[PDB]
């Protein structure tokens, strides 16, 4: 069968370069023509670029947003597709594919999220959202980088429980809201493993 | 020159029943040797985009055999057999004759079928602490509302409202949203409400601080 | 030189794209494609000896529940009475029975008299009957010599002659009862050559064996199947065990999910069909009866006895059966229950349609049953209902069902959108397809469903009448063709073309030694010389 | 998974009855009990067939199991049969024929 | 506005080509595959059980 | 279904022009290009002309060998290819073939055969053929044209018959030979449809 | 510089068991595109050929499965796994690198394949009413000969020859040939011998009038 591997991304800082390599195996490499294509977080796909085979002269071509800036190479000998991204922005924080086919995308790798961003780690602060008459729960910010983990009562309330996906601030920092509705005892637990925060609230009138 | 493409926005559908999804085009797309240059394409939440239908009337292997295509020149639909559980997500479609795409366009949402329900608004104060921060933080949370279309509007206002929207419920299938307006500490100390339109509701619901 | 790489190959695979598409085509007709129906024969107690008597009975509300017959040496003043809890009595006197079992002809078959006793008459019956089905497909019995045709069958053992035997018939009591030989006996005497095959799944015996033939004839093994079942009982020892637990309706008549559930009935039955694939039936130019479009077998397993069945097990039947079909509970319209009215059976399917058909339901579907009409057939009694559907879809019209009070409260009928089918009602053709449920579930555990569809439209076709035709006719015995004489007579009476019917008996029909020739031109001609015709001659040739 | 099994009905306990066995016979000696029965035990859901062609009855029973295992509604399959005496018919009738 | 079509073809046309080679050997393999056999017991006169 | 029909071959004598027409069904003729191909009797097959589609202009390419007399030419609205011999030769004469497909042939008609001669009906001349003391015969020679049946005692006598193949002569005439090997009654029946002759024949030592 | 390809040129084979032919080159037939540019083709005796195999390596409709083809580079092989009784024929392994194309080159012959058998020669004078008419043609015969190769000459002499070769019979699977000299009824009486070469005899075999 067919397969292939991303490799090559993690947090990166605004300004510097990075390399994105792809392993694919179960067929004939050097035939086919690879691509990439990037998907924001919360938004549509874009195609990022592709490079022909050799038998066309293994030409080039990228996204003109992004021209300029990144360059696809092969190593057909180890079968292997190399994307190499420059001067980084905020804007390119995105998940990227490396898929088979110039025009059919008929096979897609697992994906790697590359997220650019100036902020450091830091320890997520926690605040109750006290309900003044069926729901309560405990709103949580600034904390650094992806992912936190939140429970109630530590996974002993677990109906009505929402946990809004986190949305980034224009501040740069990390924040969501985890609440839970209950008519008429109740913490919400809070881990924070960049900043190994371990944080214990409770919501009451 | 480039030809465009559109199709309905989100169509629920319950499970077992044949379902059709229309995608329209700007200009025939059939070449002179005989084919149309369209494809198909499925997303799965949380998973990479798979490719199910290719020249308008071909299927892959791994596409079980319910789905199919159909159309020519400009107009062209994927009919979809019999759905389960597991083909809820984004389909898009893909021209190919006119090179390079730069992207999939908006796509389409396909989710379960249920009633329509109701969003339950829920607006909070800000937490003391959080004020004592140096900032307010002001939510209200929409629950139990199907399907989307919920808009939030605040008023005592734009640029400083961030709305998170989660996952369909597993059981209770509808939806749920959380609006928080987010100010200094002082601006909200100064003026001492956020209002709710959805097809769940009669009229619109206001709830204030 | 190899610059030939542009215009090559789109030209060369246009081909092999249109190739390769239609192997997929291939592998999704192969798994999936629709059987036909061709053959039909049923024998049914009530007189019913014709698929178009039963019909006309059920259309009619006729009742067939007869009494206990006494030609079978039953003590039947030792099994009647009022104490249920008597040892070896039954409750119940009155039920329907087929009473022409003991009636049979040995010498059609060429069968001596002594092995014709000896012989269990559910096979000799089965004989029969599938003879007759094989007639009303239209297809010569005697061209079907050295075919590749299969056989099924579904029966229980009874133990016919078990008791005290004679030092006489002896040597042909292992083959009279032994039930494989049915299926081995009509193949030998048909001189077939396709797989022969008894099955045995107790009252669902016969539904999931025509499924077997199914898969033979999508395999390919086999041209044609042959496929039913008959239930024909010599010892009133089911009763009496029945009364023992009460399972029965002290007045023998199965009240399909009605207020007055409160037992069921028991019946003998006879039926068979002839399965053949839809293109392979297309071509030959055999008529269509109706399309099978996918069937479903499983075992529910694990319950809370034995002999109660599950729910689930129905749902993931019923759900099994229209994916293989391709259908939706959309598209059906009519489902034939099993109709037990045993009071614990009846609402377990009853919500199960409630579940797995109860939903999104544009039309309100309807439901029916025709043990309320007959009875429990056993083993036939699951074919019997593919009997009557074909025959109701066939006339454009859904049968009503009997003793209809009101629906048993035991079901929240507000959930799904079904009502039971409690009057006739008409139901033609629209440019919709009409589709209809059958189902099976054997106390042995075992459950079975079938979905059928209506026959193609095919356009009519008109013809001249010949000036004069004649009109032949053949059989074995001189007697035999005086009464065959007698029902082409009969059914000339009727208003049909005289050329269409020649054509008929004269193309589908075989030639046999006694013979018969008249010479006509009107109906009326015909109808007098045949009612007059009696110079016959079985000579023999020179 | 499913089971298929072939035997030949030899009328085990068909004499003379006992009034307490009653009510279990017709279960104990019914050709589809068999399959029924084990299915039952182990808590199966594919289907259980219970054939007979005499003496090649088993042969038939994995053949169908493989066609049915070939169609691919079930894992797998159980085939097998069985045959024990209860009465000398078989030797008194074959005797006659030599 | 069609120079490179062929190109693009080739590309269209390989993948469409071994997937239905696929369909082609499932069909072979549908209806003409070896059935594997794990376990069997018997019991026969002369003491035989296993 | 896709079908092919071929016709207008037949006899006619040398230099004049003739037209074979080849009508498709059941399927986009227009989308597909058209190709002639000869064969000549005992021989090979002999490529002959392609036509493309108007996809590609339809552009009509030839052998240099039967550049100049023949042209092929397709219609759309009936979907119906055309071939035109002028200045027809003897030594043309070969079984013509229609196929789908430029370059790849997926597709055959009927086949239809070119007669080219001078000559006209002439009766069968059969001869006997007697051994010197196990084999035995009648030679048929000088008939014209095609076909002649040969039976040996209205077809009483098959074992042992051997029926060579009629060969052209070069004077535009057919022989061929009936043997029969019996050692140690033997009747030779000719008939030639198209000069009506009917010939029987005996062979004695 | 055009491509040439080769075969064995006849293959007799028993049915019942797999036979392979083999095909050469004078040329990789590897396109950038990664194909092997080779069809085959069979025509049935005195029918119309049909195709079987295209890029060596997938098989059209209609073809039985047991037909089969491999290969790369410059060499090729088709694979039958059950010989048939119709399977005779005329096979043609011919490329399509270069367009277009002129013949299909020899072609590889299939026969049934049975024992070594020797002709059975005889030679039979100008019937007598022949000679009466001018005409004299002496005719040397090959009776139940196997396999093909028969080789005849005329000595009492080239030019005025005719053969005729019947196929394979299908009762013994032998062979007959028919060779006829013509000459005027002087020539014949100028000079007062067929000689006869085929594997089947030891040696050749004359036989005069």
Redesign the interface.
Same mark, same amino acid.
């Given at each position: 069968e067919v397969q292939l591997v991303q490799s090559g991304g993690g947090l990166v800082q605004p300004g510097r370069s990075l390399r994105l390599s792809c392993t694919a195996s179960g067929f004939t490499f050097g035939d086919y023509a690879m691509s990439w294509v990037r998907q924001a977080p919360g938004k549509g796909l874009e195609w990022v670029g592709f490079i022909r085979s050799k038998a066309y002269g293994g030409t080039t071509e990228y996204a003109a947003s992004v021209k300029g800036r990144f360059t696809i190479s092969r190593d057909d000998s180890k079968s292997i597709a190399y994307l190499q991204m420059n001067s980084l922005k905020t804007e390119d924080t995105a998940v990227y594919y490396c898929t088979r086919g110039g025009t059919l995308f008929d096979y897609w790798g697992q994906g790697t999220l590359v997220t650019v961003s100036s902020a450091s780690t830091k320890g997520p602060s926690v605040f109750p959202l006290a309900p003044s008459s069926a729901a309560l729960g405990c709103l949580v910010k600034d904390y650094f980088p992806e992912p936190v983990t939140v429970s109630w009562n530590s996974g002993a309330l677990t109906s009505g429980v929402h946990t809004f996906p986190a949305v980034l601030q224009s501040s740069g920092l990390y924040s969501l809201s985890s609440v839970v509705t209950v008519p008429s005892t109740y913490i919400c637990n809070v881990n924070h493993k960049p900043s190994n925060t371990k944080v214990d609230k409770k919501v009451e009138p | 020159d480039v030809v465009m493409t559109q199709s309905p926005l989100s169509l629920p559908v319950?499970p077992?029943?044949?379902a059709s999804i229309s995608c329209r085009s700007s200009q025939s797309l059939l070449?002179?040797?005989?084919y149309n240059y369209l494809?198909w394409?499925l997303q799965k939440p949380g998973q @990479?985009?798979?490719?199910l239908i290719?020249?308008g009337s071909?299927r892959? /292997?791994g596409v079980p055999?319910r789905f199919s295509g159909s159309g020519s020149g400009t107009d062209f639909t994927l009919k979809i057999?019999?759905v389960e559980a597991e083909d809820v997500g984004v389909y898009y479609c893909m021209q190919?004759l006119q090179?390079?795409?730069?992207?999939?366009?908006?796509?389409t949402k396909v989710d379960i079928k249920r009633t329509v329900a109701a969003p @339950?608004v829920?607006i909070?104060?800000?937490?003391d602490?959080?004020l004592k /921060?140096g900032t307010a933080?002001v939510?209200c949370?929409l629950?139990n509302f199907y399907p989307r279309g919920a808009k939030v509007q605040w008023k005592v206002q734009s640029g400083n409202s961030?709305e998170?929207?989660?996952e369909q419920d597993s059981k209770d299938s509808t939806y749920?949203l959380?609006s928080?307006l987010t100010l200094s500490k002082a601006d909200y100390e100064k003026h001492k409400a956020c209002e709710v339109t959805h097809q769940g509701l009669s009229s619109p619901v206001t709830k204030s601080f | 030189m190899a610059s030939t790489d542009s215009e090559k190959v789109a030209e060369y695979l246009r081909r092999a794209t249109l190739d390769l598409r239609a192997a997929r085509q291939r592998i999704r007709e192969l798994e999936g494609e629709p059987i036909a129906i061709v053959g039909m024969a049923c024998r049914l107690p009530g007189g019913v000896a014709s698929p178009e008597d039963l019909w006309r009975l059920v259309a009619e509300r006729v009742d067939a529940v007869s009494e206990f017959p006494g030609d079978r040496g039953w003590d039947l003043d030792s099994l009647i009475d009022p104490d249920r809890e008597r040892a070896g009595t039954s409750y119940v006197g009155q039920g329907g029975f087929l009473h022409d079992a003991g009636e049979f002809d040995a010498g059609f078959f060429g069968i001596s008299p002594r092995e014709a006793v000896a012989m269990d008459p559910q096979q000799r019956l089965l004989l029969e009957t599938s003879w007759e089905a094989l007639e009303n497909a239209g297809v010569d019995p005697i061209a079907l010599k050295g075919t590749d045709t299969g056989v099924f069958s579904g029966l229980m053992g009874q133990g016919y002659g078990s008791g005290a035997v004679a030092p006489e018939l002896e040597g042909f009591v292992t083959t009279g009862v032994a039930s494989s030989v049915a299926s081995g006996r009509v193949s030998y005497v048909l001189g077939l050559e396709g797989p022969a095959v008894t099955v045995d799944t107790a009252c669902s015996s016969s539904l999931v064996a025509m499924h077997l033939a199914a898969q033979a004839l999508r395999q390919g093994e086999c041209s044609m199947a042959l496929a039913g079942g008959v239930t024909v009982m010599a010892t009133p020892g089911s009763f009496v065990e029945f009364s023992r637990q009460r399972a029965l309706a002290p007045d023998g008549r199965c009240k399909a999910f009605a207020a007055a559930a409160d037992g069921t009935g028991w019946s003998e039955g006879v039926g068979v069909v002839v399965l053949e694939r839809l293109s392979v039936a297309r071509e030959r130019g055999h008529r269509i009866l109706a399309v099978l479009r996918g069937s479903a077998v499983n075992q529910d397993g694990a319950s809370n006895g034995l002999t109660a069945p599950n729910g689930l097990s129905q749902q993931r039947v019923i759900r099994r059966a229209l994916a293989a079909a391709g259908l939706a509970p959309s598209d059906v319209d009519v489902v034939e229950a099993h109709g037990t009215g045993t009071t614990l059976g009846d609402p377990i399917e009853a919500q199960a349609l409630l579940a797995t058909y109860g939903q999104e339901r544009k039309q309100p579907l309807w439901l029916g049953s025709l043990k309320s009409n007959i009875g429990h057939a056993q083993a036939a009694a699951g074919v019997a209902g593919v009997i009557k559907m074909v025959q109701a879809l066939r006339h454009e019209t859904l049968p009503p069902t009997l003793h209809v009070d009101k629906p048993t409260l035991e079901v929240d009928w507000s959930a799904g959108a079904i009502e039971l089918l409690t009057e006739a009602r008409a139901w033609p053709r629209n440019g919709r397809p009409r589709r209809a449920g059958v189902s099976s579930f054997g106390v042995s555990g075992t459950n079975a469903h079938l979905i059928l569809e209506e026959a193609p439209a095919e356009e009519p076709v008109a013809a001249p009448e010949l000036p004069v035709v004649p009109l032949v006719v053949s059989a074995r015995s001189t007697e035999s063709l005086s009464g065959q004489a007698e029902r082409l007579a009969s059914l000339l009476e009727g208003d049909v073309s005289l050329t269409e019917v020649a054509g008929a008996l004269v193309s589908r029909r075989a030639v046999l030694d006694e013979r018969a020739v008249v010479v006509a031109g009107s109906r009326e001609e015909a109808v007098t010389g045949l009612r007059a015709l009696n110079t016959a001659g079985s000579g023999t040739p020179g």
């Amino acid at each position: 069968e067919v397969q292939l591997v991303q490799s090559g991304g993690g947090l990166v800082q605004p300004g510097r370069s990075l390399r994105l390599s792809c392993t694919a195996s179960g067929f004939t490499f050097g035939d086919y023509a690879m691509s990439w294509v990037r998907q924001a977080p919360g938004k549509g796909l874009e195609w990022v670029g592709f490079i022909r085979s050799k038998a066309y002269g293994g030409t080039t071509e990228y996204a003109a947003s992004v021209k300029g800036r990144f360059t696809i190479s092969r190593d057909d000998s180890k079968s292997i597709a190399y994307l190499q991204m420059n001067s980084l922005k905020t804007e390119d924080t995105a998940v990227y594919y490396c898929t088979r086919g110039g025009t059919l995308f008929d096979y897609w790798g697992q994906g790697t999220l590359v997220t650019v961003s100036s902020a450091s780690t830091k320890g997520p602060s926690v605040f109750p959202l006290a309900p003044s008459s069926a729901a309560l729960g405990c709103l949580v910010k600034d904390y650094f980088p992806e992912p936190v983990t939140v429970s109630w009562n530590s996974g002993a309330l677990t109906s009505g429980v929402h946990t809004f996906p986190a949305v980034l601030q224009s501040s740069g920092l990390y924040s969501l809201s985890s609440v839970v509705t209950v008519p008429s005892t109740y913490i919400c637990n809070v881990n924070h493993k960049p900043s190994n925060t371990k944080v214990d609230k409770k919501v009451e009138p | 020159d480039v030809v465009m493409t559109q199709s309905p926005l989100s169509l629920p559908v319950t499970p077992g029943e044949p379902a059709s999804i229309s995608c329209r085009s700007s200009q025939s797309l059939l070449h002179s040797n005989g084919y149309n240059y369209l494809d198909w394409y499925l997303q799965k939440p949380g998973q @990479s985009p798979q490719l199910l239908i290719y020249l308008g009337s071909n299927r892959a /292997s791994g596409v079980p055999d319910r789905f199919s295509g159909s159309g020519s020149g400009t107009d062209f639909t994927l009919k979809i057999s019999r759905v389960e559980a597991e083909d809820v997500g984004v389909y898009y479609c893909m021209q190919s004759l006119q090179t390079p795409r730069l992207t999939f366009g908006p796509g389409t949402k396909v989710d379960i079928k249920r009633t329509v329900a109701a969003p @339950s608004v829920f607006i909070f104060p800000p937490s003391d602490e959080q004020l004592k /921060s140096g900032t307010a933080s002001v939510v209200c949370l929409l629950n139990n509302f199907y399907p989307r279309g919920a808009k939030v509007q605040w008023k005592v206002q734009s640029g400083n409202s961030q709305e998170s929207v989660t996952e369909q419920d597993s059981k209770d299938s509808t939806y749920s949203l959380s609006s928080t307006l987010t100010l200094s500490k002082a601006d909200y100390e100064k003026h001492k409400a956020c209002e709710v339109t959805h097809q769940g509701l009669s009229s619109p619901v206001t709830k204030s601080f | 030189m190899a610059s030939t790489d542009s215009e090559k190959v789109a030209e060369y695979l246009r081909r092999a794209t249109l190739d390769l598409r239609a192997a997929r085509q291939r592998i999704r007709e192969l798994e999936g494609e629709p059987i036909a129906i061709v053959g039909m024969a049923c024998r049914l107690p009530g007189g019913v000896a014709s698929p178009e008597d039963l019909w006309r009975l059920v259309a009619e509300r006729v009742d067939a529940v007869s009494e206990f017959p006494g030609d079978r040496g039953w003590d039947l003043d030792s099994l009647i009475d009022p104490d249920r809890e008597r040892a070896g009595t039954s409750y119940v006197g009155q039920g329907g029975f087929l009473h022409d079992a003991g009636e049979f002809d040995a010498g059609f078959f060429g069968i001596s008299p002594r092995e014709a006793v000896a012989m269990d008459p559910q096979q000799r019956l089965l004989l029969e009957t599938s003879w007759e089905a094989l007639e009303n497909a239209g297809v010569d019995p005697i061209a079907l010599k050295g075919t590749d045709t299969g056989v099924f069958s579904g029966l229980m053992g009874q133990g016919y002659g078990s008791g005290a035997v004679a030092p006489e018939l002896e040597g042909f009591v292992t083959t009279g009862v032994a039930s494989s030989v049915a299926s081995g006996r009509v193949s030998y005497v048909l001189g077939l050559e396709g797989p022969a095959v008894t099955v045995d799944t107790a009252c669902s015996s016969s539904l999931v064996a025509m499924h077997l033939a199914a898969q033979a004839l999508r395999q390919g093994e086999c041209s044609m199947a042959l496929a039913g079942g008959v239930t024909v009982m010599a010892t009133p020892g089911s009763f009496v065990e029945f009364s023992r637990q009460r399972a029965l309706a002290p007045d023998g008549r199965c009240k399909a999910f009605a207020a007055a559930a409160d037992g069921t009935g028991w019946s003998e039955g006879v039926g068979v069909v002839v399965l053949e694939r839809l293109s392979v039936a297309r071509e030959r130019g055999h008529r269509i009866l109706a399309v099978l479009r996918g069937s479903a077998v499983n075992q529910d397993g694990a319950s809370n006895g034995l002999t109660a069945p599950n729910g689930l097990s129905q749902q993931r039947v019923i759900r099994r059966a229209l994916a293989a079909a391709g259908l939706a509970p959309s598209d059906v319209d009519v489902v034939e229950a099993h109709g037990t009215g045993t009071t614990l059976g009846d609402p377990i399917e009853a919500q199960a349609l409630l579940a797995t058909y109860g939903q999104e339901r544009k039309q309100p579907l309807w439901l029916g049953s025709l043990k309320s009409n007959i009875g429990h057939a056993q083993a036939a009694a699951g074919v019997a209902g593919v009997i009557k559907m074909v025959q109701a879809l066939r006339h454009e019209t859904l049968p009503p069902t009997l003793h209809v009070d009101k629906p048993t409260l035991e079901v929240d009928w507000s959930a799904g959108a079904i009502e039971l089918l409690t009057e006739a009602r008409a139901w033609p053709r629209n440019g919709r397809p009409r589709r209809a449920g059958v189902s099976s579930f054997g106390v042995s555990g075992t459950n079975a469903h079938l979905i059928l569809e209506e026959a193609p439209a095919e356009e009519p076709v008109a013809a001249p009448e010949l000036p004069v035709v004649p009109l032949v006719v053949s059989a074995r015995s001189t007697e035999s063709l005086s009464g065959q004489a007698e029902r082409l007579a009969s059914l000339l009476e009727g208003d049909v073309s005289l050329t269409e019917v020649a054509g008929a008996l004269v193309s589908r029909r075989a030639v046999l030694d006694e013979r018969a020739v008249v010479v006509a031109g009107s109906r009326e001609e015909a109808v007098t010389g045949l009612r007059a015709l009696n110079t016959a001659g079985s000579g023999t040739p020179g």
